[PDB]
Design a protein around this nucleic acid. Structure first.
Ligand SMILES: [Mg+2]
Ligand SMILES: [Zn+2]
Ligand SMILES: [Zn+2]
Lengths: 87, 602, 164
RNA sequence: AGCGCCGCAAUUCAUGCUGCUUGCAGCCUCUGAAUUUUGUUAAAUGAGGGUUAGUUUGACUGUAUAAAUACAGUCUUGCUUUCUGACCCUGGUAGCUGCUCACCCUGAUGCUGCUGUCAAUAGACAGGAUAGGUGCGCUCCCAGCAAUAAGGGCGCGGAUGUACUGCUGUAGUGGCUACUGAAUCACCCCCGAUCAAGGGGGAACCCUCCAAAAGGUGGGUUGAAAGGAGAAGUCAUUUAAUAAGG
DNA sequence: GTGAAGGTTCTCTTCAGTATTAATAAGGCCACTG
DNA sequence: GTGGCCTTATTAAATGACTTCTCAACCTTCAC
């Protein structure tokens, strides 16, 4: 689970502006935090198929959002994935 | 069916178990995986599928350069040989499956072409129905194997009248019929064949044998990829998911010892039977078995000692032990795998080799087969093969002095027919065939006797355990179980009851039905009905008769047939195959199954 | 009988880019047919209700388009033009609308569902994926009887000025 | 209500019984078949989870016999399963982590359903398979909930180029890991073993036997079955995720 | 020098497949007429 | 009794089943 402080820090860091809470860039940043933590869990917990179910959802959610961003603008898309460290 | 398996736990100190586990998991199973990969890429692979046969030596040839590859080099000679046998039998299995499926697809595709309605047969013959009926009466009078003979007659007879007459004659089960064709029952029967062709076509898209990766390196690298990389499209992400859901293989492939003397038996000073394997004699394993099997493991030592005392003038061709499989059974709980899992030896024996009379049966079977071989076989190593065969043929004459038990004698005119059904798994009729009289019926309830309550237990547990799995799946709970072992128990109880009744009436044989593939018949029948009832509504079609289709997929007619065949062979009762009639009750089906198998003796 | 009458049905002319879902909906309304009714009339059964949602596993086959081309007098080649051409990826769920096209021709265009389409080149407008006044998503094109948003009743022709 | 199962009762009957004439004719006690009712103080079924290298289901040889098997002697090992008993539980402490929820309507193979102290709110404590409904049981039905089947309705905020997102708490409910609680058994107790390991001591009932009012040698017994296994492919069902399908 | 590990061959699979006798069905809600 | 509705695909897993294949043996060599 994700703390409100880490959540709000993600919001502030990826916001387009101070009241943006839901742009696709903020959404993929939130999902990237979740995917990173859950990958570390599943590397240690291969039999946690319940948690693995969540990963496949989260990876798909981010895949759809990044594909949406990429055809709004490749400049914003490339900058965003570079910040998040996604190849 | 005189080959059976007996098993024992193998016990040894930890360093022996660890050394064997590492040989199996780190070298032998990776070698098997590599052989499966290379064999599936071989340029002759596509012609092996057409022959349905693997070359006798191609796995051995592929393994030779791998025996000194740093990935695989550390193994005894018999472990390489075991890996070869594993891989060779896998493809012998898979190529045989694909070959038969292809023949089924070709056979039914021809039938779909020659299945024409009388409205179509009128046009395609150009003759009135009475005219083709007469021509079918002539062609039947010549073809008098009848089915195959008509299928032979069809192909090269390009004369559309005779060709249509054969089509009409085959539509009716190789016979004349006066009655009119019900056009909707024909259209349904045509549709069944299309579904069967489609389902055969889909089954022929089987995967190549997948192997056992025990490291699961592909899973972890895919996890790192899918979490840090953008998927190029949906199909890459789907392939990632398909890998991430794939479950890890825990256990290596077992070892196979096709030379019975590669298991060397001994008794330790604490009096326990012990075994070691060729190439691993430093690892002594202690035999821990039930007394109900101990007499076999004692026999393995006595057979070994007999041939040593005779300075190898006996043949191991008559050793009661045939081969061994060395298996790790999955342990519950946690530990290092050589501690967690339990090492188990499975020995094939031929039950006839227990007695002296049965050994004489095997000796003649061996002698005839080897005398045939030596005559037909006639290089230096091929001449050495002849000399080994001639040594076997000489040495099988030396007796092991085994227990004498006179062979079963059954009356040729007394048969037991066993009717198999979805509702009543077995029903038997003892028939005196020259008298044409039933000596005894038994129902399923009389066969099970006091065990009959197990049959309602099975139905009740199959319902209950399916529903508990359904509930557990939604929670991702691992606690998913089923009644397969109870079902196996019931089929073995029935098999013993049937054979005991056969012995009691001195039946010469047990008659079993040629059911064919009941599941593909039922599945294509129900689909053809459902497509009429739910046109354009696939989920309605799949809901239709769902529980009947499930019941037919659970019907264990093969396991019951196999259990009967094994028990009859262990008492020397002949098994015969007959055709079960569709008419009548299970009792009448069993009687007419028995009597038809008697009349089919030619 | 009426003498010298040929057995007949109410027809509709398909518009130049009209989607199959929109077209079948008009034909059904012109004949007060339920979605199940047209499928029974063509004999393909429940498939029509599936096509009207753009659920195209499998795609409309040659057999079924030729079957529908028996009750609808539009030929199967023209019915295939109501669908994505081969290999053009389409999305069924987000139903989309240009509005400025709807003021010129009251049909849903199948190209508004293509994964490659986002602007109307004719109008130079970003096509809508929900009602711009009240954010309600558009219903399946078979159900566009009123030509307006089902929630706030704004006509699709007025949503033209709420684009791009 | 429906469906499955269970027995009950009834009819007909042969795989049952009776007879001389051994292929037929009666009958329905026994042992079974055909599915026909019916739920009764009946007789049968009965599904919360777990607990033994448990016992019996063996091998060989001699003797007997019509097989079936039976008796006597010698040997015996612990594998993989199916039942019947008996016993124990309703778990604990830290971590990691999924899913769910703005709100409303409908209600799914959804969730929950025991006893009795206490107790207005809240659940706790002590019992415990008697666990909602019927003879028993269900995904059916009843009652409460339902966000965690599907759908539908409809807020403000972000976003609005097809992606969607927030309203979400010491929250509800799953999974995984580590450590840990009870039975860890086959007549009972105690001390040990668990890749090997057994030892000690008792209670009932029956044999065997001093010549005997009385207890006591030498032993026996204290629930049964089944077995052909590995490897590879496939089908079916269900669950989860993804996609809108070349 | 008896025991352990390791070598060696075993052929061809143009053959097998394709037909019946088929069972009452196996669909369930809603609303709406007749 | 008529009529409307009910989406369909792939891949992985568990369970229950089915099918196929396999089930040598004598000899040589080097090690006390
Ligand atoms: Mg989408
Ligand atoms: Zn436009
Ligand atoms: Zn609106």
């Amino acid at each position: 689970a994700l703390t409100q402080e880490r959540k709000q820090e993600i919001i502030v860091n990826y916001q387009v502006h101070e009241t943006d809470t839901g742009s696709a860039d903020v959404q993929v940043a939130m999902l990237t935090e979740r995917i990173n933590r859950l990958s570390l869990h599943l590397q240690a917990n291969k039999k946690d198929h319940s948690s693995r179910r969540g990963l496949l959802k989260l990876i798909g959610q981010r895949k759809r959002l990044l594909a949406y961003i990429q055809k709004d603008s490749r400049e914003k898309y490339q900058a965003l994935i570079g910040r998040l460290g996604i190849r | 069916s005189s080959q059976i398996t007996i098993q024992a736990r193998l016990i040894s100190f930890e360093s022996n178990r660890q050394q064997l586990w590492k040989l199996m998991a780190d070298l032998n199973t990776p070698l098997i995986n590599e052989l499966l990969c290379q064999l599936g890429q071989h340029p002759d692979f596509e012609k092996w599928q057409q022959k349905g046969k693997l070359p006798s030596t191609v796995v051995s040839q592929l393994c030779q350069p791998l025996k000194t590859d740093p990935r695989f080099a550390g193994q005894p000679s018999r472990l390489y040989m075991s890996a070869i046998h594993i891989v060779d039998y896998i493809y012998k299995s898979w190529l045989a499956i694909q070959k038969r499926l292809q023949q089924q697809l070709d056979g039914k595709t021809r039938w779909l072409e020659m299945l024409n309605s009388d409205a179509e047969l009128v046009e395609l013959s150009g003759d009135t129905l009475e005219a083709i009926r007469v021509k079918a009466a002539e062609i039947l009078a010549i073809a008098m194997s009848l089915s195959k003979t008509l299928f032979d007659a069809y192909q090269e007879t390009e004369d559309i009248k005779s060709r249509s007459a054969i089509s009409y004659l085959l539509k009716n089960g190789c016979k004349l019929t006066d009655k009119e064709e019900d056009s909707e029952k024909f259209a349904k029967r045509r549709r069944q064949v299309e579904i069967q062709i489609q389902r055969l076509t889909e089954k022929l898209i089987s995967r190549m044998p997948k192997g056992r990766d025990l490291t699961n390196a592909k899973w972890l690298e895919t996890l790192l990829t899918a979490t840090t990389t953008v998927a190029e499209d949906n199909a890459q992400a789907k392939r990632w998911q398909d890998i991430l859901l794939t479950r890890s293989s825990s256990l290596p492939f077992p070892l196979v010892f096709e030379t019975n003397e590669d298991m060397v038996w001994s008794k330790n000073q604490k009096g326990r039977l012990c075994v070691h394997f060729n190439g691993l004699s430093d690892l002594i394993f202690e035999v821990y078995c039930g007394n109900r099997q101990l007499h076999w493991f004692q026999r393995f030592l006595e057979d070994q000692q007999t041939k040593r005392k005779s300075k190898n003038q006996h043949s191991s061709g008559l050793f009661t032990l045939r081969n061994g499989h060395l298996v790790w059974l999955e342990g519950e709980g946690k530990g290092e795998p050589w501690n967690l899992h339990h090492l188990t030896l499975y020995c094939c024996v031929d039950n006839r080799l227990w007695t002296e009379e049965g050994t004489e049966i095997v000796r003649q079977e061996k002698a005839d087969e080897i005398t045939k071989f030596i005559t037909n076989m006639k290089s230096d190593t091929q001449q050495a093969l002849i000399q080994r065969k001639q040594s076997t043929l000489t040495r099988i004459n030396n007796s092991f002095e085994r227990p004498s038990q006179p062979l079963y004698q059954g009356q040729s005119h007394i048969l037991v027919g066993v009717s198999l059904g979805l509702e009543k798994p077995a029903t038997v009729a003892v028939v005196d065939a020259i008298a044409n009289k039933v000596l005894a019926y038994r129902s399923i309830k009389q066969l099970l006797g006091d065990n009959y309550e197990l049959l309602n237990r099975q139905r009740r547990q199959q319902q209950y355990l399916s529903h508990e799995r359904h509930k557990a799946q939604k929670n991702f709970s691992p606690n998913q179980f089923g009644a397969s072992e109870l079902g196996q128990h019931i089929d073995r109880l029935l098999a013993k009851a049937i054979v005991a009744l056969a012995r009691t009436y001195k039946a010469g044989s047990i008659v079993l039905p040629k059911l064919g593939d009941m599941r593909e018949v039922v599945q294509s029948e129900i689909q053809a009905i459902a497509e009429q009832k739910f046109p354009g509504y696939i989920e309605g079609q799949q809901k239709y008769a769902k529980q009947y289709r499930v019941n037919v997929h659970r019907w264990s007619y093969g396991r019951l047939i196999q259990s009967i065949q094994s028990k009859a062979a262990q008492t020397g009762i002949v098994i015969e195959e007959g055709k079960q009639p569709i008419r009548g009750s299970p009792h009448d089906k069993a009687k007419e199954l028995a009597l038809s198998a008697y009349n089919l003796r030619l | 009988e009426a003498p010298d009458v040929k057995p007949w049905l109410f027809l509709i002319k398909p518009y130049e880019g009209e989607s199959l879902s929109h077209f079948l909906g008009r034909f059904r309304r012109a004949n007060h047919l339920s979605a199940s009714g047209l499928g029974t009339l063509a004999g393909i059964g429940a498939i029509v209700a599936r096509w009207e949602r753009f659920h195209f596993n499998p795609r409309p086959s040659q057999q079924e388009l030729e079957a529908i081309a028996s009750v609808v007098e539009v030929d199967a080649q023209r019915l295939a033009q109501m669908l994505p051409p081969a290999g053009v990826g389409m999305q069924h769920e987000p139903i989309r609308l240009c509005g400025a096209c709807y003021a010129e021709s009251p049909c849903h265009r199948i190209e508004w569902q293509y994964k490659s389409v986002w602007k109307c080149d004719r109008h130079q407008l970003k096509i809508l994926a929900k009602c711009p006044n009240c954010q309600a998503p558009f219903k399946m094109p078979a159900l566009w009887e009123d030509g307006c948003c089902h929630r706030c009743r704004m006509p699709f022709a007025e949503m033209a000025k709420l684009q791009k």
